[PDB]
Design a protein around this ligand. Sequence first.
Ligand code: NI
Ligand code: NI
Ligand code: NI
Ligand code: NI
Ligand code: NI
Ligand code: NI
Ligand code: NI
Ligand code: NI
Ligand code: NI
Ligand code: NI
Ligand code: NI
Lengths: 249, 253, 243, 240, 250, 240
Amino acid sequence: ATLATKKATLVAALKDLQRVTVAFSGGIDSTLVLKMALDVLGRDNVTAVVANSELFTDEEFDKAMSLAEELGANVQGTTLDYLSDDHIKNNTPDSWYYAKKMFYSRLNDIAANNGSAAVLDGMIKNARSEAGARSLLQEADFFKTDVRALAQELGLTNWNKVASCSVSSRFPYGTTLTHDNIAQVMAAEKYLRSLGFPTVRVRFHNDIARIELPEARIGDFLVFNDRVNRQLQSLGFRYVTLDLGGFRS
Amino acid sequence: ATLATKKATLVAALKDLQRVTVAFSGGIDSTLVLKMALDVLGRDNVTAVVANSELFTDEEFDKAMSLAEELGANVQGTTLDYLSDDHIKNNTPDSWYYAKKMFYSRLNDIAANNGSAAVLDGMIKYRPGLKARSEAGARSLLQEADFFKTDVRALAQELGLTNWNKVASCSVSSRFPYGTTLTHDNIAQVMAAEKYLRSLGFPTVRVRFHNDIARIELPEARIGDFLVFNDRVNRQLQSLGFRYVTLDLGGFR
Amino acid sequence: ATLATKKATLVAALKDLQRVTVAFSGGIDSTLVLKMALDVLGRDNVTAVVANSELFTDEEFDKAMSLAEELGANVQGTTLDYLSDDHIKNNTPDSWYYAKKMFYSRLNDIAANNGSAAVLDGMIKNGARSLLQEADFFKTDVRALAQELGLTNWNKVASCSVSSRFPYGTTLTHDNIAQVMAAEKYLRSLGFPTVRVRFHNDIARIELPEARIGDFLVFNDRVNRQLQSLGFRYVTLDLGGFR
Amino acid sequence: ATLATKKATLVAALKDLQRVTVAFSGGIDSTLVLKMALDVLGRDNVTAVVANSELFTDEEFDKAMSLAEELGANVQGTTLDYLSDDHIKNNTPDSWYYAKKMFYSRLNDIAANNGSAAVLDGMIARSLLQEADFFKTDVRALAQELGLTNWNKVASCSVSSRFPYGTTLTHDNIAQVMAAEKYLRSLGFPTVRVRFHNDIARIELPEARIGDFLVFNDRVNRQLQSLGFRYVTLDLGGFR
Amino acid sequence: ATLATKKATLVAALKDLQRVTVAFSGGIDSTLVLKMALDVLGRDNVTAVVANSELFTDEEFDKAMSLAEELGANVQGTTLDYLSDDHIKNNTPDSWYYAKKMFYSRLNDIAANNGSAAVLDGMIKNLKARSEAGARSLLQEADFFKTDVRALAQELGLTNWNKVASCSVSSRFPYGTTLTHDNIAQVMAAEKYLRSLGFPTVRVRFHNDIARIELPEARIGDFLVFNDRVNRQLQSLGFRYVTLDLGGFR
Amino acid sequence: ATLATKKATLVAALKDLQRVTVAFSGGIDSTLVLKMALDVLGRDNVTAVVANSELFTDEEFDKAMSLAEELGANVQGTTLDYLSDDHIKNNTPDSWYYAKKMFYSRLNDIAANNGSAAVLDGMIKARSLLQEADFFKTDVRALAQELGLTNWNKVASCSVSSRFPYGTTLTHDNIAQVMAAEKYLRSLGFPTVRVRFHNDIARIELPEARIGDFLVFNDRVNRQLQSLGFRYVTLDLGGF
Ligand code: NI
Ligand code: NI
Ligand code: NI
Ligand code: NI
Ligand code: NI
Ligand code: NI
Ligand code: NI
Ligand code: NI
Ligand code: NI
Ligand code: NI
Ligand code: NI
């Protein structure tokens, strides 16, 4: 009921596992799991693994890696190659499930090799089980309130403040993903973010880019129409369009 | 040579044919041919034909018929079904030509039935075969008389012409990519969308059709004035059947 | 029928009337009636009357008189007392009826005094004669016959009584009318010809066509200050736009 | 005049008042005092009080209650019936005064009953931050030094400001003003006022945001009309 | 005097000259003069002259030639080197006079060569270079005001004429700034590009390496989509900084 | 390579220098050095010098003096006079150089008189220990956040000479003119701005992402900068 009880539940679970591998994204939840794993088991009994793949930017990978080092963890990157999977390459609605399966399977191979007793992720009370990953925060009945509370108790102040999605969301279901069109959309969103628009999606429709921006920024945005049009055309789109519905129509 | 030179060739050619059928669009050129046909041959020897189809608005057809009435011609509308042709229904790059072929075929049939010696259009100055005009024996007397756009404006008001169509319409096919199949419903979809955008105060507009995406082209100078309508345009074009409603950052042209 | 028929119908009505008095506002429709009245009957058989009153701007009254002269009419101004009628002063929903009655009554007396057979106005399709509407003219036909006649100059923005700027039941006064008229005159001088300053006591509620509101933001502060000095305590833009 | 100097001033001030009651709004200032009260005096010697009333949003109260619990304080809600006071319900120009009187009267009773030595608020009743010469630069510095990251960043005014003097406050027009401002904030405008003029809503926004706002004109109009206003207007003077 | 009186006076004057050369700008005044000359004397006895120079846009010149051809006149272009006259090149308050002097001097030479008895311009009632050349203002001799001009244009069915009263590009340079064929080319290329974006009323004021764009304030909102292209384009025309004047059009 | 590596080299350099003088401008970089000087060398072995001049704002000095005192450093202001040099008074393309020498010449006496072993400044990728320790802008923001630094000049104050064309003579009249114009624009919500001086023309540089938000202020800026002495007030289409 109290936070002190739930933290104690989490300290006891970590002591029992003795040695863990942590699925680390840089968000506040995995930051709390990793910091508690370090404080309870020590640096040499924790391995933080950050996933690098073609579906996420190298920028999020470098930031997640540097966050783990700043907490004082041994951090190890692993590269997954999600497009080896037919369900991800053709982006079926079931893609998410197979993506998680490939993710958790690699962490069990890593955890097996380093002698950990379990793989931990950051999920809270509101294919992980198929691979046997442990969600200690959810087992100790943490809610988002309890994460912020115990993060403040531990002096954690730095974490990825916006948790991303995979670039597959920029493609309609059934569209085949390639290393090129993925690079195309990610270059396009990175360029838009460089003009000062941190929240943006460049949705992919073959020869059409359909830009989603938050509606409150559209007025500030017209000064960039022509540069955005020309820049995304050089990236391979034949038309660059602004979606009148805005961000997530 | 001079303008008097070109009217004489054009008067002579009209006098020889005696009775004519005129493909009439409402533009300065077809207005000019038709007024010269009437002034040289009289009302009873000239028929103006205006084409109705789904690829143009019911509004533009009503306007072309009235201008012909105001010049004093007997005017006949004829309605085509361009989508009966696979090159038009499937919107190939030659589709313009096959459209003219079906049009000139219908006017020749009209002209044969009323006893005219030729079909006249208002043409002055890359295809799959013969010129659709030469295939039909249609004559472009303004072009045979070497009319320039200066001579058309010049001899038109030597004739006192005051009203015509300053905005040349464009077949609704242009809103569809090459290879995309046109249907009576998606044509209606694009046309309702453009009629609605125009009613909000944007006379020059295109709604390009990209399946579930509508890509609106507007003159860039109007995009600032336009944001006040983003939400209404999005929901309205959605009710017309598009899943996404988008503005092209390149603008109209 | 054809436009040539509707022009012929209109020429026939005018020849039969022989002498007419024309209610002239300066818009395209009354401009067309007046020019065709002149082209059929001549200057000496046509009288153009422009109404001046407190419910319409002095600017449109001046422009209509000069436009009537420029079309070649004998033009006569007349001044109406719309606020002498209690239904107009207290802005009741039937105020338009007593206003219209008073207008046509003044114009019938002018016509009786000058021997005209009818008062003509500019009403179109969709006891005064509306020859355009009897001939089935639409707004499309009016632009056609205006261009065929070479008419180019008229007031492109239709005037409407200043009563519409006040709620029903609000008593119109010379002061609140003057302030609403000063406020719209200033808005029009910045480049917004169709505008309304609706009067809600200490609140001015500006209606503009929505397509102009983006162009308008550069004027927010100057408009706010000027209408405040005209007597409004708050100056507001109506998010619904014009009408 | 270093920060460590004033934190020593502030903890020393807190050490004297061995038991404290903290008037807690959720802003950076009351959050700093509340964590500082807990860390210097302990949970059992600090009571955080959140006021529930009709003049502030249900959202600010829920957020102040969850944040206070997240700081690890024993939290007490208290509900003030501000409109039972004629001086507040008819919104005279003196109303602010009767409101603060009812508020601090409620917290003095809570403090007396729980054995506190004083009521603490967040001013920059004792304003220990202002006695210790804290500035907002100083508040952000020491909040981070304790690892504070969560607070309400939009400080609410009393809803009385949206009503003309002499206008009678009701549960219905309050609900209307609060619904309109919640909707405006959800489109991306955290600083906003919907002034109430009977059938007219007069929206104040910072002029610097009015350009960003044009894309929402139509939705704001339809939404505020559905909340009961007949006309929805933007004030060309902007916010204040 | 009635409008029929004033039109009759003008028909009498034109009948007397038989053969005329008309200084034609495209404005309502010269358009009325040119149409009356044609209506009274016929196409073979009227020559419309439109002046081309570096101080006016090709767009205003081409439109005046088309307006004259569309009225049914024989139209002739003539090109004036206004910068050959130092009084014009040094951009003083009297430079417009010397421009008119050079203009009417050229029109007398054209009229001499084609046998016209007079040069006609469009001046109306309310100047010195006009009288010193013996150019005649038949609208002003018949007591036409701008109200008389619009009336007879409508009775003549004239509907098309040039509404922008085109001004010489010297106004884009301060008094005393010396005009060159290169800096004029710079200012006019810049305004041609601005007008091509949908801004017919514009001024590019010249301040050495700085362009100061004046637009009507009601269009400045519409303009933001063009900031970057206008900046780069005017820089490639030679300005080092490209600016929008917050005061607007004057 | 790692952030912990770069912090360790920087503490090692400071321990070797024993006593330091830090040229303090108020930016994130010099703020980062100055707190790190305190953490390794202590208050009694670090001297913070903030330079006051005619080419910098009075506002940037108060913030630099207030930051230093807040940071808990022994802080000393020193007043220089860059316009005494003829190459800066006429603003030759070489101005920055004669200006830079005069700054570092006065700062060496502080250290020398102070007995300090080196003068430290804040340059990243006189000793520039941040650049010697291979700090980039990401590394500086990271270690500033790890150290709990929350207050610094988020808009870097630059020399007012930058607003004048080469060859233009600087005056006390036109400097104040340029400085008054930027203070007024920033008060409207534009913290990043340049008012460029072209005699009778003011040429305003803003970030392009804010130019749309800016149209509501055109008229007030125009009248205000006209009364400061500019004949024309213009916005630069290339932006800041
Ligand atoms: Ni691959
Ligand atoms: Ni499957
Ligand atoms: Ni069919
Ligand atoms: Ni009654
Ligand atoms: Ni506009
Ligand atoms: Ni109650
Ligand atoms: Ni009392
Ligand atoms: Ni030369
Ligand atoms: Ni001389
Ligand atoms: Ni030197
Ligand atoms: Ni903005």
